[PDB]
Design a protein around this ligand. Structure first.
Ligand SMILES: Nc1ncnc2c1ncn2[C@@H]1O[C@H](COP(=O)(O)OP(=O)(O)OP(=O)(O)O)[C@@H](O)[C@H]1O
Ligand SMILES: Nc1ncnc2c1ncn2[C@@H]1O[C@H](COP(=O)(O)OP(=O)(O)O)[C@@H](O)[C@H]1O
Ligand SMILES: Nc1ncnc2c1ncn2[C@@H]1O[C@H](COP(=O)(O)OP(=O)(O)O)[C@@H](O)[C@H]1O
Ligand SMILES: Nc1ncnc2c1ncn2[C@@H]1O[C@H](COP(=O)(O)OP(=O)(O)O)[C@@H](O)[C@H]1O
Ligand SMILES: [Mg+2]
Lengths: 1622, 80, 193
C-alpha cells in the first residue's frame, strides 16, 4: 500500500508548496526558485509513472490519472511563465529607464504599458494567493500567459531601430545579439544579470567585481579567475546610464593596466641586469601581476637590455656584454624550469608556461644576435626583431609603451586579454609577424594563406594579443553578404578591434567584390588618419560605411585567412587581393613547437621527446594506410602534447597520493627525476591516435612506436566502475557486452575509446560503415555516464542534410535585417542561456547525417580553440564547457582537411558489430518485449528457444547470409537490411502463431506444431529476406544452397524450388500454386485498374508485403516500370482495412516540402506532455505514404538526397524537426512504402546504405511468358464472352498479343530512345481497347477482331516510335504475327493498311473509310473556322491519323497527351480542334516575362476549380516553353499522376474550395459534408474531367532530362510522336 | 555501330597489354618490424585492387560492345 | 565614381552614377562586371539608346570570361591587360608607371635602386612564363608587389639618408631591402623552399 502513502505525501507537498515571491523595486513580487519547482514536478511525474508500472496501480489508476493531468497542467503553465516573467523584467527596464523610446516609439510603448498593467494585475492576484493550485485553478491562466508571451514577443521583435541607436551609442554593443542587447539594456539596474554578457563584449573580461551595494565597479575578472583592481573605481550611481559607465569601465581598465604595467616593469628591472635571481622573489613578482603583464614586463626588460648592450658595442672594437644578456636569460630560464618541475597553482603554472615560452624565444634571438656578430643597434638583424620600448616619462600612460618591428611602430592597446594560450615563436611565426606588421604600417590587410592547421588564425590572434588589441574571429560563409559585412566593419571601425575573417573565400565572388569597396574605403580612412598632419582636435577621419559616416579608430585592421584549393571556396577578385599582403603558411616548424611545449610543461627530456615524436608523426603520415578520416597535421601534435601534459600531471598526483597513503615521504625532485616521460608520451599518443586507426593499421602503428620508442609499453587502465556501468546499461537495453576477447570486446573497447576522446576534445566524429554500432555506442556511453557521475545527459540528434542550411544555422532577412535562429543555433543558444538549468547537464549535439563542406565548414570556429559560433549578424555564441559536438557519419569522402583535423575520430569497422551480437540482441528483444504491446510472451519465448540453434555462430543463418553476399542483388546488399527483414518476418510468424491460438481457444498450438512451423518459417524467411531483392535464378541458387547446408526437412519436390512453397500454420510445406486459382473475371471488370489476376509471383509478393506491412515496417519495391509494384502493393493493402494509402510521386526536384505538405493535408500536429505528435486526422487508421520514385530525387555533388535523408531520419528516429519553431515532432500511426526502378536505369541514383538499412527490398520483375499468357488469356476469355462466335479465338489471340509484345520489347530498348519502355501496361491497354471496341457490337467476324487487334497494336507500339524504319518494322511484324497465329483468314479485309477507327460517323467505334472521314473533318473544320478559330488548315492523311489519336485519348478517363514534334506542325491547333469536337474547353496559360510560380499556382487552382467543382471538361494545353521554373514541372507531375496537388489549396483558398465542392456535390445529388470525402470527390472529378496536352520539341537530351525531372510525363501521358512533316 | 567496334578493339588491346595477376603480401611477426614490408604490402595491396577494378571495368566494356550485357549508369559513364 | 559590381546596392549605385555622369560629364568605373552578365546586357541596352556628355567616359574593368555578353563586347572598345612580352617591355612599363618625381628625390642613389628593383621585377615575372623551370607554380607576382617594394625602398632610403644629396653605396641598407623583399613583399606568395 506504498502507492497510497506516496500519493498522500505528494498531496501534502503540493498543498504546502507556495510560490516564493521577491519584490522588484516596489513594483511586483516575482516567482523565485524555478529549479526547485521544476525538479519537484519532474520527480513527482516520474514517481507516478513508476507507480503506473506497478500492478496495484489499478485501484488508484483514476486518481493517479487526474494527478498526472494536473501535474502536466503545472508543467505547461510554468514552462511559459518563467519566460514571460523574464521578458517583462528586461522589457520593463527598456520602457521605463529610457525616456527617448517614448518619443521615438510611442505606439508599442502604450502597448507595453497595457500588457504590463495586465501582468501586474495577474501578479498581484498571484501575490494574494501564493498557493500553486490557487495559481493553477485561475480561469484562463494558461491562455492569459500564452497571449502575454505572444504580445511581449511582438513588442520585442519591434525594437530593432532602438537597438541600432544603442549600438551606435556604445560601439562594443555591435557584437551583441538583439536578445542579449535587450537583456543588457533592461537589466542595467540589476548588474548581477549582466555578468554572463561581458565575455562577448571584451577580449578577456568575463565578469566585473562589484562592492556590496552593487553601485561601484571595483575591477574586472577573467574566466580563469584572474582579477584586475581599478586604481579609480567607477561608480554606477553617478552614471546611471549603462553605456556611460561601461565606457568608463573600459577607459579605467586601460589606464589601470597601463599603470600596473609600469609598476611591473619598474619591479622587473631588478631581475634584469642581475647575475643571480632568487626563485622566491621571482615567484612573488609573477603572482603579483597578471599573465599578460608579466610577459610584457619580461619582453620590455629583455629588449631594453639588448638595446643597451648593442649601444655599448657600437664602436665595434668594444667588449661583448650581449653574453651577459644571454647569461641572464639562461639563468631566468633555469629558475623558471625548476619552478614548473614542482607543483604550482594553475594560474601560476600558466604564467610560468607563458614566461618559459617567451624566454625561450628571447634566448634563441639573443643566440642569433651573438652568432651573427651584431654590434650596431641600427643593424637590420636587430631591427627585424619585435622590440618593446617603455617610456615612463610619458605623461599619457597609454602611450608609455611602444612596440616596434622593422619600420612599423604600434602602441599597446592595453585590452585585458585574460590568460590566453601563448604560441611558440617559431621562425614561421616570426615571418608572419614581420609580414603582418609591414602590411599594417602600409595600412593594408593581412592574408595568411595555406593548408588547414598551419597556425594562421592563431598567429593573427597572437599578434593581436601581442599588441594588446581586441581580435575578433568571424567564421565567414556564403551568407555573409554585403550588408552584414558592412555592419561588422562599422563595428570594428567604431570599437577599434582586429577582425580575423577566417575562411574568407567561402563568400560568393560577387559578395567578395562588393566587400572590396568597404575594405578600400576603410583602408583609405586609416591611411589618412596615419598622416601626422592630422590632429586630435581635427574630427577623426570618417569612412562612409553603409551610406553612413562612421568614425575609424587607428587600432583596427582587417585580416583574412583562407585555404586555397579546398572544396567549397571561391576566388578573390584582383581588386580585392591587391588590398591585402598575402603570406604563405605551408610548413609550420613542428619540432620547435613540440620541444618548447614539452619544456614548458615540465619534461626534463623535452628535446629528445620532440625529436622522437615529430619524425614519428611523419612516419605515421607516410606509413599507415591512406584513409579519408586520417589527420596527422599540427593540430594532432598539439592535442598529443596537451594530453601528454595532462597525463604527466595526473601521474604526479597519483604518485603523491600513493606516497601520502603509504607512509609520509614526498619529494618533488624525486618524483620528477623518477618519471617515465616516454611512457607518458606513448600513452597520450595512443589515447589520441589509436581510436581513429583501421584494424590493419593498429599493429603497424604499434610496431612504429616500438621502433621509435623502444622499451616502453602502453597498459590501458581498467575503468572498472565505467565497465560496470556499461554492463548494466547493456543489460537494460538488451545489448551484448564482452570484456576483452569475449563476444563484444571490440565494441566496448570502442566505447571506452569514445569516452577517452570525449574527455579530451569538444568535437568528435564516429566514422564507420552502416551497422557498426556507432549510435548504440554513444547512447550506451551517455547513459552510463549519466548513471555513474550523477549528471543527467541529454542528446540532441540533428540530421544536418535533411534540412536546408538556412534552417540549420539561421537566416538573415535581406529586407529588415532580422535574425531568425536555425536549428543548431537555437539548440546552442538555449543551452547557453540555461533558463531551465541546461548548463548543469551533459549536453551532446550529435550530427547524425552526411558531412560536406557546405554546412560543416560553418563549425570550424566551434571545433577550433575559439569555441565560437559566429553568425552573419555579428553575434558570437561561446560553446559551454559541458557541450560536445558529435558527428555520426558513415564515410568522410567529401569533407575537406579543415574539418577532419578539427575533430577527434573514432573508427568503427563492421567487425566491431559481429553477427552474433545482433543475433543475441534480437533474441533478447524477442524474449522480453511483447509484440502485441501473457500468452504473447510464452509464444515468443518458445519460438526464441526453437530458433536458438540456428541463430548461432557458423549456423544456418550465418552461412546463408555469407552466401547471399556472393549473389547478385538489384540493390547493394547490407547485413543489417537482411537481418531486419528476417527479424520482422519472424515477428510476423509469432503473430501468426498467436492468431492461430486465438482462433482455436479450445485447442491451442502444441510444442511439436510450434517447432515444425517455426523451423519451416525460419527457412522460408531466410530465403525471402536474403534473396528477395534478386532475380529468380539467384532465389533458386540460394534455395539449393540452403537445401545443401540446412538440416530442417525441406520440400521433397524434385525440380520445384523452395521459394515456390509457403509454410502453413499446421507446420507443413504447401506449394503456392494451391493458392493460384483459375479465376473467371467478370465481363465488365476486364482489365479494370483494381482487378488482379492471381499468379505465383502475385501471391508470393502479396504474402511478403502483408507480412512486412503488418509490422508497420518501411519497405521498398524495386523493379522495372510496369512490372506491377503499385498493383501488388494495392492488392496487399486491400487485405488491411485499417491502412489508408496516400500516393506520392517523387521527381528530380523533390524536396521534403512535398512530404511536409502531405503531412499538413492528411495529418495534424497536437501538443502532448511528451512533445508534438503528428498523427493522421482519421482515428485508428495507419497512413501509408507511398513514394513512387523514391530514388529519382537529385543527388548533390556530395552524394546525398535531401528527401532520402529526411525519410531516413523519420524512419530511424521516428520523427523530424519542425523548422517553424525548431520543435521535435514524433510520428504516430505513419509508415512509408517506396517504389523505384533499378538504380542501373538512367536517371536513377543508388539509395544510401544508411537508408537501405531500415527498408527491406523486394524485386518485382516482369511476368514471364507463361505468367503473361495466363493473365491475358484469362482477360481475353472474360472479354470475348460478348461475342459467342469469337470465344474460340481467345487462346490464339492472347498468344499473338504476348508474342508481339515480347518482340517489341526486345527490338526497342531504352538505349535507342528514352521513352522506348514496354511493360504489361501496354498489354492492359491493349485488352482495354479491344474490349471497348467490342463492347457495343452485337456480332463480329474473326476478320474484324484481327483488324481491331492490329489497330490497337499500331496505336500502342507505333505511336511513340521516332524513325520511319521502326514504324515499318512494327507494321510488318504485326502482319506476320497476325498471319502466323490466325491462318485461313482473308488478309485484305482485315489488314488494309489505312487502319482507321472512329466513332464520329456512327454511335459505335467502327472502322471508318479515309475519304468519308476526310469529308466529315472538312465539314467540322468549316464549322470550327466559323465558330472558334479562323486559321485555315490543309488536310492530309497524317492529320487524320493525329486527330483520331487525340480523339482516342480525349475520350478516356485521366487521358493525358504528350505531343512531341517540331514547332509549327499543328499540334496545338489539332488539340484545340479535337477538344472543340469533344466538348472540352481549351485552357492555355498566358505566360509573360513576369510570370512566376504563384501565377501558375493561381492558374492551376482556377483550372482545378472549373474541372472539379463545376463538372466542366477542360483540355489543359501546355507547352514546354511555358515551363519557366522546375516548380511548374513538379506541380504538373503531381497533378498528372494523382489528379490533385496537395499543397495547392491552403488557408482561405482551401475553405472556398471546400464550399464550392459542397455546392457541386449538392448539384450532383451526393450527400457529403466532411472535408475528406469532399476532397476525394473533387479529386475524382478532376481525374474524370481534366485532360492535359503537353507539347514539346523533339530534342535529344531534352527528352532524357524530362524523363527524370517529370517521370509522370512518360507514365500517365500517352506519347504521340508527331515529328516533322514527312 | 562504328564507335562500338572501335571501343571494342581498343578495349581488347588494352586487356592484352595489362597483366592479369598480383598476389598480396603476407603478414608475419618479424615482417611488421620491417618498414620496407610495411610500405611494400601497401603497394601490392593498392596495385592488386586497382588492377582488379580496371580489369573488371574493361571486361564489362568489351561485354557491352558485343551486346551480351546491358548498360548501367556507371557503365555508360565509363563508356563515355 | 568607382563602384564594385556584385550587389543589388552596387547595381543601384552604378545606375545612379551613370545617370548623373551622362549629364555632368564625369567618369564612372565599374569593377568586376563579369559577375553580372544579365545586368551587363541590360547596361548595354541602356547605353545604346543614350546621348551622354562629351567628356563622359565609362570604364568596365573585368576578367577575360566567356560569360561576358557578345553585344557588350561589340559595343565597347576592348583593352587587354596582361604580362608584358619581354624584359625590355616590362622595364619600360615599370618606369612609365612610377612617377618621375618619385625616382628623382634627394638621394642620387635612389634611381639606381629603382632600376635594380625594376630589373628584378622583370626577371621574376618573365621566369613565370616557363612555369616548371622558372618557378614551381604560377605565382601572382604583380604590380602590388612592385608598389610595395618601391615603398619599402623609399622608406628605408629616407631612414638611412636624412635628406642628404648623396649616400655612400656601403651605407645603403642592403640587408633591410633584401630581407624584406625576400620574406614579406615577394616571398609572401612563395610557398616552396
Ligand atoms: N553491443 C551490441 N550488442 C548487440 N547488438 C548491438 C550492439 N550494438 C548495436 N547492436 C545492434 O546492431 C544494430 C546496430 O545499430 P546502430 O544504430 O548502433 O548502428 P550504427 O552503426 O550507428 O548505424 P548507422 O550508420 O546506420 O547509423 C542494431 O540493430 C542494434 O540493435
Ligand atoms: N607556434 C605555435 N605554438 C603552439 N601551438 C601552435 C603554434 N602554431 C599553431 N599552433 C596550433 O596549431 C593549431 C592551428 O590553429 P589555427 O591557426 O586556428 O588553424 P588554421 O591555420 O587552420 O587557421 C592550433 O591548435 C594552434 O594552437
Ligand atoms: N497478375 C496480374 N493480373 C492483372 N494485371 C496485371 C498482373 N500483373 C501485371 N498486371 C498489369 O501490369 C500493370 C502494372 O502497372 P503498375 O502497377 O503501375 O506497375 P508500376 O507501378 O511498377 O509501374 C497493371 O496495369 C496491370 O494491369
Ligand atoms: N495542316 C495544316 N495546314 C495548314 N496550316 C497548318 C497546318 N497545321 C498547322 N498549320 C499552321 O500552324 C500554325 C499553328 O501552329 P501551332 O499548332 O501553334 O504550332 P505548335 O504545334 O508548335 O504549337 C497555324 O497558323 C497554321 O497556319
Ligand atoms: Mg546509427
Amino acid at each position: 500500500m506504498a502507492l497510497e502513502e506516496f500519493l498522500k505525501q505528494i498531496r501534502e507537498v503540493w498543498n504546502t508548496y507556495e510560490l516564493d515571491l521577491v519584490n522588484y523595486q516596489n513594483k511586483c513580487r516575482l516567482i523565485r526558485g524555478w529549479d526547485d519547482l521544476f525538479n519537484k514536478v519532474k520527480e513527482h511525474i516520474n514517481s507516478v509513472s513508476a507507480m503506473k508500472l506497478s500492478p496495484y496501480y489499478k485501484v488508484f489508476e483514476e486518481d493517479a490519472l487526474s494527478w498526472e493531468d494536473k501535474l502536466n497542467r503545472i508543467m505547461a503553465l510554468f514552462d511559459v511563465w518563467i519566460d514571460v516573467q523574464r521578458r517583462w523584467v528586461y522589457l520593463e527596464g527598456i520602457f521605463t529607464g529610457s525616456a527617448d523610446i517614448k518619443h521615438l516609439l510611442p505606439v508599442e510603448t502604450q502597448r507595453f504599458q497595457s500588457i504590463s498593467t495586465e501582468f501586474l494585475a495577474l501578479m498581484k492576484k498571484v501575490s494574494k494567493s501564493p498557493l500553486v493550485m490557487d495559481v493553477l485553478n485561475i480561469q484562463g491562466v494558461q491562455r492569459s500567459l500564452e497571449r502575454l508571451a505572444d504580445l511581449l514577443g511582438k513588442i520585442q521583435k519591434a525594437l530593432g531601430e532602438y537597438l541600432e541607436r544603442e549600438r551606435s551609442s556604445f560601439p562594443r554593443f555591435y557584437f551583441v545579439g538583439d536578445e542579449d542587447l535587450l537583456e543588457i539594456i533592461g537589466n542595467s539596474k540589476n548588474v548581477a544579470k549582466l555578468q554572463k554578457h561581458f565575455k562577448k563584449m571584451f577580449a578577456g573580461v568575463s565578469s566585473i567585481i562589484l562592492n556590496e551595494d552593487n553601485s561601484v565597479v571595483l575591477g574586472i575578472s577573467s574566466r580563469e579567475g584572474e582579477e584586475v583592481m581599478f586604481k579609480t573605481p567607477v561608480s554606477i550611481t553617478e552614471h546611471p546610464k549603462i553605456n556611460e559607465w561601461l565606457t568608463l569601465v573600459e577607459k579605467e581598465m586601460r589606464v589601470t593596466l597601463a599603470k600596473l604595467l609600469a609598476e611591473s616593469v619598474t619591479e622587473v628591472e631588478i631581475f634584469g641586469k642581475a647575475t643571480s635571481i632568487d626563485p622566491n622573489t621571482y615567484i612573488t613578482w609573477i603572482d603579483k601581476y597578471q599573465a599578460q603583464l608579466v610577459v610584457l614586463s619580461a619582453q620590455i626588460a629583455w629588449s631594453e637590455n639588448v638595446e643597451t648592450a648593442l649601444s655599448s658595442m657600437g664602436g665595434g672594437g668594444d667588449a661583448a656584454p650581449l653574453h651577459s644578456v644571454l647569461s641572464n636569460v639562461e639563468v631566468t630560464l633555469n629558475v623558471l624550469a625548476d619552478s614548473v618541475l614542482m607543483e604550482q597553482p594553475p594560474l601560476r603554472r600558466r604564467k610560468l608556461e607563458h614566461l618559459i615560452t617567451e624566454l625561450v624565444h628571447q634566448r634563441d634571438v639573443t643566440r642569433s644576435l651573438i652568432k651573427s656578430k651584431i654590434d650596431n643597434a641600427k643593424s637590420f638583424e636587430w631591427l627585424s626583431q619585435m622590440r618593446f620600448y617603455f617610456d615612463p616619462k610619458q605623461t599619457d600612460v597609454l602611450q608609455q609603451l611602444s612596440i616596434q618591428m622593422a619600420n612599423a611602430k604600434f602602441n599597446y592597446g592595453f585590452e585585458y586579454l585574460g590568460v590566453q594560450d601563448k604560441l611558440v615563436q617559431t621562425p614561421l611565426t616570426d615571418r608572419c609577424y614581420l609580414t603582418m606588421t609591414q602590411a599594417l604600417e602600409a595600412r593594408l590587410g593581412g592574408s595568411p594563406f595555406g593548408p588547414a592547421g598551419t597556425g594562421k588564425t592563431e598567429s593573427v590572434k597572437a599578434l593581436g594579443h601581442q599588441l594588446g588589441r581586441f581580435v575578433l574571429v568571424f567564421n565567414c560563409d556564403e551568407t555573409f553578404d554585403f550588408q552584414a559585412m558592412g555592419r561588422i566593419f562599422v563595428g570594428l571601425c567604431q570599437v577599434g578591434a582586429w577582425g580575423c575573417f577566417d575562411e574568407f573565400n567561402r563568400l560568393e565572388e560577387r559578395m567578395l567584390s562588393a566587400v572590396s569597396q568597404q575594405v578600400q574605403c576603410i583602408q583609405e580612412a586609416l591611411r589618412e588618419h596615419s598622416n601626422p598632419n592630422y590632429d586630435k582636435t581635427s574630427a577623426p577621419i570618417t569612412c562612409e560605411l553603409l551610406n553612413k559616416q562612421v568614425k575609424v579608430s587607428p587600432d583596427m585592421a582587417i585580416f583574412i585567412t583562407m585555404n586555397p584549393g579546398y572544396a567549397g571556396r571561391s576566388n578573390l577578385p584582383d581588386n580585392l587581393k591587391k588590398l591585402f599582403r598575402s603570406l604563405a603558411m605551408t610548413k609550420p616548424d613542428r619540432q620547435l613547437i613540440a620541444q618548447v611545449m614539452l619544456y614548458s610543461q615540465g619534461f626534463r627530456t623535452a628535446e629528445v621527446l620532440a625529436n622522437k615524436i615529430v619524425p614519428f608523426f611523419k612516419l605515421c603520415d607516410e606509413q599507415l594506410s591512406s584513409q579519408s578520416h586520417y589527420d596527422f597535421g599540427l593540430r594532432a601534435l598539439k592535442s598529443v602534447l596537451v594530453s601528454a601534459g595532462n597525463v604527466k600531471r595526473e601521474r604526479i598526483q597519483k604518485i603523491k597520493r600513493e606516497k601520502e597513503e603509504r607512509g609520509e615521504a614526498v619529494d618533488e625532485g624525486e618524483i620528477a627525476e623518477n618519471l617515465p616521460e616516454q611512457e607518458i608520451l606513448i600513452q597520450s599518443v595512443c589515447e589520441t591516435m589509436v581510436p581513429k586507426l583501421v584494424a590493419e593499421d593498429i599493429p603497424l602503428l604499434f610496431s612504429l612506436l616500438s621502433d621509435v620508442f623502444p622499451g616502453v609499453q602502453y597498459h590501458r587502465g581498467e575503468m572498472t566502475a565505467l565497465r560496470e556501468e556499461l554492463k548494466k546499461v547493456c543489460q537494460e537495453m538488451y545489448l551484448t557486452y564482452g570484456d576483452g576477447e569475449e563476444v563484444g570486446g571490440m565494441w566496448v573497447e570502442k566505447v571506452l575509446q569514445l569516452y577517452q576522446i570525449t574527455q579530451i576534445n569538444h568535437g568528435l566524429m564516429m566514422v564507420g560503415p552502416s551497422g557498426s554500432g556507432k549510435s548504440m555506442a554513444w547512447r550506451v556511453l551517455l547513459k552510463a555516464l549519466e548513471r555513474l557521475e550523477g549528471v543527467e545527459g541529454v542528446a540532441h540528434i540533428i540530421d544536418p542534410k535533411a534540412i536546408s542550411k538556412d534552417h540549420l544555422y539561421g537566416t538573415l532577412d535581406p529586407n529588415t535585417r532580422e535574425w531568425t535562429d536555425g536549428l543548431f543555433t537555437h539548440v546552442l543558444r538555449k543551452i547557453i542561456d540555461s533558463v531551465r538549468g541546461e548548463l548543469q547537464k551533459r549536453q551532446w549535439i550529435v550530427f547524425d547525417g552526411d558531412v560536406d563542406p557546405e554546412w560543416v565548414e560553418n563549425l570550424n570556429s566551434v571545433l577550433d580553440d575559439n569555441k565560437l559560433l559566429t553568425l552573419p549578424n555579428g553575434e558570437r555564441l561561446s560553446l559551454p564547457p559541458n557541450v560536445r559536438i558529435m558527428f555520426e557519419v558513415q564515410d568522410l569522402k567529401y569533407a575537406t582537411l579543415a574539418t577532419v583535423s578539427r575533430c577527434g575520430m573514432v573508427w568503427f569497422s563492421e567487425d566491431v558489430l559481429s553477427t552474433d551480437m545482433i543475433f543475441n540482441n534480437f533474441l533478447a528483444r524477442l524474449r522480453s518485449i511483447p509484440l502485441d504491446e501473457s500468452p504473447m510472451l510464452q509464444i515468443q519465448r518458445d519460438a526464441a528457444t526453437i530458433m536458438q540453434p540456428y541463430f548461432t555462430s557458423n549456423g544456418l543463418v550465418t552461412k546463408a547470409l555469407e552466401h547471399a553476399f556472393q549473389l547478385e542483388h538489384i540493390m547493394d546488399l547490407t547485413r543489417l537490411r537482411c537481418l531486419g527483414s528476417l527479424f520482422s518476418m519472424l515477428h510476423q510468424a509469432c503473430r501468426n502463431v498467436a492468431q492461430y491460438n486465438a482462433n482455436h481457444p479450445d485447442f491451442p498450438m502444441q510444442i511439436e506444431q510450434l517447432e515444425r512451423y517455426i523451423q519451416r518459417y525460419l527457412v522460408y524467411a531466410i530465403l525471402w529476406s536474403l534473396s528477395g531483392d534478386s532475380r529468380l535464378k539467384m532465389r533458386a541458387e540460394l534455395g539449393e544452397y540452403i537445401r545443401r547446408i540446412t538440416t530442417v526437412p525441406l520440400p521433397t519436390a524434385p525440380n520445384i524450388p523452395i521459394i515456390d512453397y509457403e509454410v502453413s500454420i499446421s507446420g507443413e510445406w504447401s506449394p503456392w500454386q494451391a493458392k493460384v486459382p483459375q479465376i473467371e473475371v467478370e465481363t465488365h471488370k476486364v482489365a479494370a485498374p483494381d482487378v488482379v489476376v492471381p499468379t505465383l509471383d502475385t501471391v508470393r509478393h502479396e504474402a511478403l508485403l502483408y507480412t512486412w506491412l503488418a509490422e508497420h515496417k518501411p519497405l521498398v519495391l524495386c523493379g522495372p516500370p510496369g512490372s506491377g509494384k503499385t498493383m501488388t502493393l494495392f492488392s496487399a493493402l486491400r487485405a488491411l482495412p485499417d491502412m489508408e494509402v496516400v500516393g506520392l510521386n517523387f521527381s528530380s526536384a523533390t524536396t521534403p516540402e512535398l512530404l511536409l505538405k502531405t503531412f499538413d493535408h492528411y495529418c495534424e500536429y497536437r501538443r502532448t506532455p511528451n512533445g508534438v505528435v503528428l498523427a493522421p486526422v482519421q482515428l485508428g487508421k495507419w497512413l501509408v505514404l507511398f513514394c513512387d520514385e523514391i530514388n529519382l530525387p537529385d543527388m548533390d555533388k556530395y552524394g546525398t538526397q535531401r528527401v532520402i535523408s529526411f525519410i531516413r531520419q523519420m524512419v530511424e528516429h521516428g520523427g523530424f524537426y519542425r523548422t517553424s519553431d525548431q520543435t521535435w515532432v514524433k510520428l504516430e500511426r505513419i509508415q512509408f512504402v517506396g517504389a523505384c526502378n533499378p538504380p542501373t536505369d538512367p536517371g536513377r541514383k543508388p539509395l544510401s546504405h544508411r537508408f537501405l538499412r531500415h527498408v527491406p527490398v523486394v524485386y518485382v520483375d516482369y511476368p514471364g511468358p507463361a505468367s503473361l499468357t495466363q493473365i491475358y488469356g484469362t482477360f481475353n476469355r472474360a472479354m470475348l464472352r460478348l461475342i459467342p462466335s469469337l470465344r474460340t479465338y481467345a487462346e490464339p489471340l492472347t498468344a499473338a498479343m504476348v508474342e508481339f509484345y515480347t518482340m517489341s520489347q526486345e527490338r526497342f530498348t531504352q538505349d535507342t530512345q528514352p521513352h522506348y519502355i514496354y511493360s504489361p501496361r501496354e498489354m492492359t491497354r491493349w485488352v482495354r481497347g479491344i474490349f471497348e471496341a467490342l463492347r457495343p457490337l452485337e456480332t463480329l467476324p474473326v476478320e474484324g477482331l484481327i483488324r481491331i487487334w492490329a489497330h490497337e497494336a499500331l496505336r500502342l507500339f507505333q505511336d511513340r516510335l521516332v524513325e520511319d524504319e521502326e514504324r515499318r518494322w512494327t507494321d510488318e511484324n504485326i502482319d506476320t504475327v497476325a498471319l502466323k497465329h490466325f491462318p485461313n483468314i482473308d488478309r485484305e479485309k482485315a489488314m488494309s493498311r489505312p487502319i482507321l477507327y472512329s466513332n464520329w460517323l456512327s454511335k459505335d467505334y467502327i472502322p471508318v473509310d479515309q475519304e468519308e472521314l476526310r469529308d466529315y473533318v472538312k465539314a467540322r473544320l468549316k464549322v470550327f473556322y466559323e465558330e472558334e478559330l479562323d486559321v485555315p488548315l490543309v488536310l492530309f492523311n497524317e492529320v487524320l491519323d493525329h486527330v483520331l489519336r487525340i480523339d482516342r485519348i480525349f475520350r478516356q478517363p485521366q487521358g493525358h497527351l504528350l505531343l512531341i514534334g517540331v514547332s509549327g506542325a499543328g499540334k496545338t491547333t489539332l488539340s484545340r480542334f479535337v477538344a472543340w469536337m469533344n466538348g472540352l474547353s481549351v485552357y492555355q496559360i498566358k505566360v509573360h516575362r513576369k510570370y512566376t510560380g504563384e501565377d501558375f499556382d493561381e492558374d492551376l487552382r482556377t483550372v482545378l476549380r472549373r474541372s472539379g467543382c463545376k463538372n466542366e471538361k477542360i483540355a489543359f494545353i501546355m507547352d514546354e516553353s511555358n515551363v519557366l521554373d522546375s516548380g511548374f514541372l513538379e506541380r504538373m507531375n503531381t497533378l498528372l499522376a494523382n489528379g490533385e496537388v496537395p499543397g495547392l489549396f491552403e488557408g482561405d483558398e482551401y475553405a472556398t474550395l471546400m464550399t464550392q465542392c459542397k455546392e457541386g456535390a449538392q448539384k450532383e445529388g451526393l450527400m457529403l459534408d466532411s472535408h475528406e470525402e469532399l476532397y476525394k470527390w473533387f479529386t475524382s472529378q478532376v481525374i474524370r474531367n481534366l485532360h492535359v496536352v503537353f507539347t514539346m520539341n523533339p530534342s535529344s537530351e531534352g527528352l532524357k532530362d524530362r524523363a527524370a525531372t517529370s517521370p509522370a510525363l512518360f507514365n500517365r501521358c500517352v506519347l504521340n510522336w508527331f515529328g516533322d512533316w514527312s | 555501330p562504328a564507335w562500338m567496334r572501335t571501343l571494342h578493339t581498343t578495349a581488347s588491346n588494352w586487356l592484352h597489354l595489362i597483366p592479369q595477376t598480383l598476389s598480396h603480401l603476407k603478414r608475419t611477426v618479424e615482417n611488421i618490424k620491417d618498414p620496407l614490408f610495411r610500405f611494400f604490402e601497401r603497394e601490392v595491396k593498392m596495385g592488386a585492387k586497382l588492377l582488379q577494378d580496371v580489369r573488371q571495368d574493361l571486361a564489362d566494356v568489351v561485354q557491352v560492345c558485343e551486346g551480351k550485357k546491358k548498360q548501367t549508369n556507371y557503365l555508360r559513364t565509363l563508356i563515355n | 565614381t568607382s563602384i564594385a559590381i556584385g550587389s543589388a546596392e552596387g547595381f543601384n549605385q552604378a545606375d545612379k552614377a551613370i545617370n548623373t555622369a551622362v549629364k555632368s560629364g564625369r567618369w564612372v568605373m565599374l569593377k568586376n562586371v563579369h559577375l553580372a552578365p544579365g545586368w551587363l546586357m541590360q547596361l548595354e541596352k541602356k547605353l545604346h539608346s543614350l546621348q551622354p556628355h562629351a567628356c563622359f567616359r565609362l570604364f568596365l574593368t573585368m576578367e577575360i570570361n566567356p560569360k561576358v555578353p557578345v553585344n557588350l563586347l561589340r559595343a565597347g572598345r576592348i583593352f587587354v591587360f596582361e604580362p608584358p612580352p619581354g624584359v625590355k617591355a616590362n622595364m619600360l612599363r615599370t618606369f612609365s608607371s612610377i612617377p618621375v618625381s618619385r625616382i628623382c628625390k634627394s638621394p642620387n642613389e635612389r634611381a639606381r635602386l629603382y632600376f635594380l628593383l625594376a630589373w628584378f621585377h622583370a626577371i621574376i615575372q618573365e621566369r613565370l612564363r616557363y612555369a616548371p623551370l622558372g618557378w614551381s607554380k604560377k605565382y601572382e607576382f604583380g604590380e602590388s608587389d612592385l608598389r610595395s617594394a618601391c615603398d619599402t625602398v623609399d622608406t628605408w632610403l629616407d631612414d638611412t639618408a636624412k635628406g642628404r644629396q648623396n649616400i655612400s653605396p656601403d651605407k645603403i641598407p642592403w640587408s633591410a631591402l633584401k630581407t624584406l623583399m625576400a620574406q614579406s613583399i615577394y616571398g609572401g606568395r612563395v610557398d616552396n623552399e
